[PDB]
Amino acid sequence: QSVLTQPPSASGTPGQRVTISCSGSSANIGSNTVNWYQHLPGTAPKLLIYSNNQRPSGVPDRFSGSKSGTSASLAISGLQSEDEADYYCAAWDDSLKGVFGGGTKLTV
Amino acid sequence: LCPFGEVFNATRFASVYAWNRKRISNCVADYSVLYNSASFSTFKCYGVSPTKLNDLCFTNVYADSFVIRGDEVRQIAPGQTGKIADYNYKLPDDFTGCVIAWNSNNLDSKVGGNYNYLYRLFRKSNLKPFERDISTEIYQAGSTPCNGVEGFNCYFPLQSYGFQPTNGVGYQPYRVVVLSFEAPATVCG
Amino acid sequence: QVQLVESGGVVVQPGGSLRLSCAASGFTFHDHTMHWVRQAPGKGLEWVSLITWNGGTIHYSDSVKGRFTISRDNSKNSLYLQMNSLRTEDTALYYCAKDLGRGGWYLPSDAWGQGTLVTV
Ligand SMILES: *[C@@H]1O[C@H](CO[C@@H]2O[C@@H](C)[C@@H](O)[C@@H](O)[C@@H]2O)[C@@H](O[C@@H]2O[C@H](CO)[C@@H](O)[C@H](O)[C@H]2NC(C)=O)[C@H](O)[C@H]1NC(C)=O
Ligand 1 atom closest to residue B33's alpha carbon, by position in its atom list = 37
d(CA B174, CA B108): 9
Kindly list the domain boundaries of chain B, sorted by start residue: 1-112+165-189, 113-164
DSSP element (H, E) containing C30: none
Ligand 1 atom closest to residue B5's alpha carbon, by position in its atom list = 38
The CATH homologous superfamily for domain C3-118 is: Immunoglobulins (2.60.40.10)
User: How many C-beta neighbours within 10 Å does residue A41 have?
Assistant: 8
d(CA B46, CA B181): 10
User: Would the CB of B58 count as within 6 Å of ligand 1?
Assistant: no
User: Nearest-5° angle of CA A18, CA A24, CA A29?
Assistant: 90
Q: Whose CA is nearest to atom 24 of ligand 1?
A: B37
Q: How far is Cα of residue A9 from the mean position of the Cα atoms in its chain?
A: 12
List all residues 6 or more positions away from B114 whose beta carbon is below 8 Å from its beta carbon: B108, B161, B162, B163, B164, B173
Best residue in B121, B137, B149, B159 to probe C by mutation, most C CBs within 10 Å? B159
Would you tell me which residues 59-88 of chain C have a C-beta closer than 8 angstroms to some C-beta of chain B? none
**Of C53, C6, C39, C51, nearest in space to C25 by CA:** C6
Distance from residue B173's CA to the centre of ligand 1 (Å): 21
DSSP element (H, E) containing B182: none
**Of A17, A44, A22, A48, nearest in space to A104 by CA:** A22
DSSP letters of B104-163?
A: -TTTS--TT-BTT-EEE---SSPPPTT------PPEE-SSS--TTS-BBTEEBSEEE--B
List all residues 6 or more positions away from A48 whose beta carbon is below 8 Å from its beta carbon: A36, A37, A38, A55, A56, A59, A63, A74, A87
User: Would the CB of B9 count as within 6 Å of ligand 1?
Assistant: yes
Give chain A's radius of gyration (CA, Å): 13
d(CA A51, CA B153): 9
Residues of A in contact with C106 (CB under 8 A): 33, 92
**Of A106, B152, A7, nearest in space to C59 by CA:** B152
d(CA C9, CA B40): 47
Q: Whose CA is nearest to atom 2 of ligand 1?
A: B9
Residues of C in contact with B138 (CB under 8 A): 103-104
Kindly list the domain boundaries of chain C, sorted by start residue: 3-118
Q: Is C3 on the interface with B (CB under 8 A)?
A: no
Adjacent-strand bridge partners of A47: A37
d(CA A8, CA C34): 29
User: Nearest-5° angle of CA B168, CA B172, CA B176?
Assistant: 150
d(CA A81, CA C30): 40
Q: Is C100 on the interface with A (CB under 8 A)?
A: yes
Best residue in C6, C45, C60, C100 to probe A by mutation, most A CBs within 10 Å? C45
Experiment type: cryo-EM
d(CA B79, CA A20): 32
DSSP 8-state secondary structure symbol assigned to residue A30: I
Topology at the third CATH level for domain A9-106: Immunoglobulin-like (2.60.40)
* Cα–Cα separations (whole angstroms), residue B9 to A11, A35, A66, B39, B89: 55, 44, 47, 11, 21
Ligand 1 atom closest to residue B39's alpha carbon, by position in its atom list = 21
d(CA A27, CA A31): 6
